[PDB]
């Protein structure tokens, strides 16, 4: 706690916070856990005008060497007064974000900075990769019923999902193209993508080093219950650099790329905080290891 | 439509009004992008490649220069968890439009990427670390921190961390535990009470447009009005303001600054979408002009 060189931002109850904290302890580095979730009520943060004047529970933390950013963060208070509650959350979150922005400015290697949030915007992240020579699904974010009917008339079998996440993907069928609900794009835009058929592959990239590429297939084992099987795989070096270009162009140090397979893969999303324990166990592959490696590197 | 100069805001906005009428006075009709009417009365379509941006069928892949003025009740009281998600979907699409343009090479006059460096607890640190004078400040939820700050600094003020309320002066009743201990609900910004003259410096593309002193005069019973009159600043200060605008990453900027007890300036804040109409008049400065000229210069 007096050695704030490596900071893990997140709750000690979070599994990945535990995994990274332990995997670092095993290498002789006891990280500082910045439990943001408990900030205003049971922790103090104080900022001076000088960038270095950052104080957490009285202790100064001007510039960590590296930060693993898992999360920054009884809400019936919203059901009471939404406006006050929103402004208060904004005060909270502004202070925390300022802490992390100051660390990045001072020179801390934040593993996925909160700046990349801009370049993670789905409709922009895709266009970013696409206009850089990367394969992506024929996509379409719209609020026009007619626009999507031409999208359908062109690409045929396709699906729809939320623009910013918040619901599981649903296959677009003809009853959705009905004037009953296709007019409801009036209330909010929707993402429509072509229906890719090949396999789901996930590629971890940590500081311009493809750590692995894992296949995720499913086996149906019970009534409406299926389980994933992860398989360590090797990838064309062309794509083991095509990926690295995506990570560096979006601005992520540690990323989990999501590709889906024609018979050749296309990039769907880069994840600014992908989990790993699921894959770490379903294919006995190591990701926490290289993450801790990259973290302890910045201390030298 | 000639989508080389786009003005994002509502035609009812007096500022987009000024900018559009100035651009017209110079041989360009902008495409006003009234984004209030996004969900309902307007269609936007984005494809996988960045050029495929369509507003009402008409595509707008790459303007020369954007002037961003804004990007934008009971539906909340009823169901709040879905209202927020709906607003976020609309907002994400609009922001993707703006980011795509900037990535093409559009001169977005103040991009939304600035909203990062805009946050006061980081912007003041940026300016302070670059050697520019900022006021002594403390952003905190720590009553002991506030007590030490008040003792160190003297007269203080407190304002929200991200704005939203009139700043008030710190009094002893506020340091009483009754009030002070409410800092556990959300943090607060405390600052030294600067006691000088309000000054505002306008900067477009690393050129200082003018510097205006803002005073107030009592015209009616408990009613004041602002008098905004021009002053001259040294080339020293002019270069500092240009550097501050560049540090925060803004093209059009109205810098709020202020003398203190010493008659020397402190940058208070840099606005990412400052107004200018109330300033141009009595000062006989023209800001709308230089802004429109800078816009046309990108075409």
């Amino acid at each position: 706690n007096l050695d704030t060189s490596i900071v893990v931002v997140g709750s000690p109850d979070d599994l990945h916070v535990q995994s990274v904290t332990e995997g670092l302890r095993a290498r002789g580095h006891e990280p500082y856990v910045f439990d943001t979730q408990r900030f205003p009520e049971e922790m103090t943060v104080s900022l001076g005008e000088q960038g270095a004047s950052i104080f957490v529970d009285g202790q100064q933390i001007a510039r960590p060497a590296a930060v693993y950013l898992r999360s920054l963060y009884a809400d019936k208070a919203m059901q009471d007064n939404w406006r006050r509650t929103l402004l208060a959350f904004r005060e909270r979150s502004t202070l925390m974000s300022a802490v992390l922005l100051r660390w990045e400015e001072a020179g801390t290697a934040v593993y996925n900075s909160p700046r990349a949030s801009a370049n993670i915007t789905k409709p922009f992240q895709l266009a970013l990769l696409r206009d850089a020579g990367l394969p992506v699904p024929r996509s379409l974010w719209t609020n026009d019923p007619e626009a999507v009917r031409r999208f359908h008339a062109e690409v045929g079998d396709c699906i729809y999902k939320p623009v910013a996440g918040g619901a599981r993907t649903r296959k677009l069928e003809a009853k959705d193209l009905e004037a009953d609900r296709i007019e409801r794009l009036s209330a909010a835009p929707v993402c429509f993508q072509e229906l890719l058929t090949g396999d789901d592959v996930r590629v971890y990239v940590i500081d311009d080093q493809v750590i692995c590429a894992l296949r995720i297939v499913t086996d149906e084992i019970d009534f409406r219950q299926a389980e994933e099987r992860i398989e360590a795989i090797e990838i064309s070096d062309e794509v083991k650099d095509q990926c690295v270009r995506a990570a560096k162009l979006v601005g992520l140090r540690y990323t989990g790329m999501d590709i889906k397979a024609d018979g050749n893969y296309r990039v769907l999303e880069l994840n600014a905080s992908a989990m790993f324990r699921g894959f770490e166990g379903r294919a006995n592959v190591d990701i926490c290891g290289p993450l801790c490696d990259a973290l302890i590197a910045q201390t030298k | 439509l000639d989508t080389s100069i786009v003005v994002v805001g509502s035609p009812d906005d007096l500022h987009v009004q000024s900018v559009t009428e100035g651009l017209r006075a110079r041989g360009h009709e902008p495409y006003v992008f009234d984004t209030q009417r996004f969900p309902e009365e307007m269609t936007v379509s984005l494809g996988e490649q960045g050029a495929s941006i369509f507003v009402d069928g008409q595509q707008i892949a790459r303007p020369a220069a954007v002037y961003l003025r804004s990007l934008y009740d009971k539906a909340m009281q009823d169901n709040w968890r879905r209202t927020l998600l709906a607003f976020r979907e609309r907002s994400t699409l609009m922001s993707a439009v703006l980011l795509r343009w900037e990535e093409a090479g559009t001169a977005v006059y103040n991009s939304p990427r600035a909203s990062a460096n805009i946050t006061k607890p980081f912007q003041l640190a940026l300016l302070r670390d670059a050697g520019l004078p900022v006021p002594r400040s403390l952003w905190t939820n720590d009553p002991e921190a506030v007590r030490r700050f008040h003792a160190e600094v003297g007269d203080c003020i407190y304002k929200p961390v991200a704005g939203g309320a009139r700043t008030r002066k710190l009094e002893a009743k506020d340091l009483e535990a009754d009030r002070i201990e409410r800092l556990s609900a959300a943090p607060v910004c405390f600052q030294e009470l600067l006691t000088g003259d309000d000054v505002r410096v306008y900067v477009i593309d690393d050129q200082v447009i003018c510097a205006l002193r803002i005073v107030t005069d009592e015209i009616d019973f408990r009613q004041a009005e602002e008098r905004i009159e021009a002053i001259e600043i040294s080339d020293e200060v002019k270069d500092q303001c240009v550097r501050a605008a560049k540090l925060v990453g803004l093209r059009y900027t109205g810098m709020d600054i202020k003398a203190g007890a010493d008659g020397n300036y402190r940058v208070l804040e840099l606005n990412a979408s400052a107004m200018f109409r109330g300033f141009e008049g009595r000062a006989n400065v023209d800001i709308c002009g230089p802004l429109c000229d800078a816009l046309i210069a990108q075409t």
């Binding site: 999902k161 939320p162 619901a167 649903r170 409801r184 929707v190 | -």
Partner: peptide, 5 residues
Amino acid sequence: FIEDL
């Protein structure tokens, strides 16, 4: 439009 939201 998306029910699960």
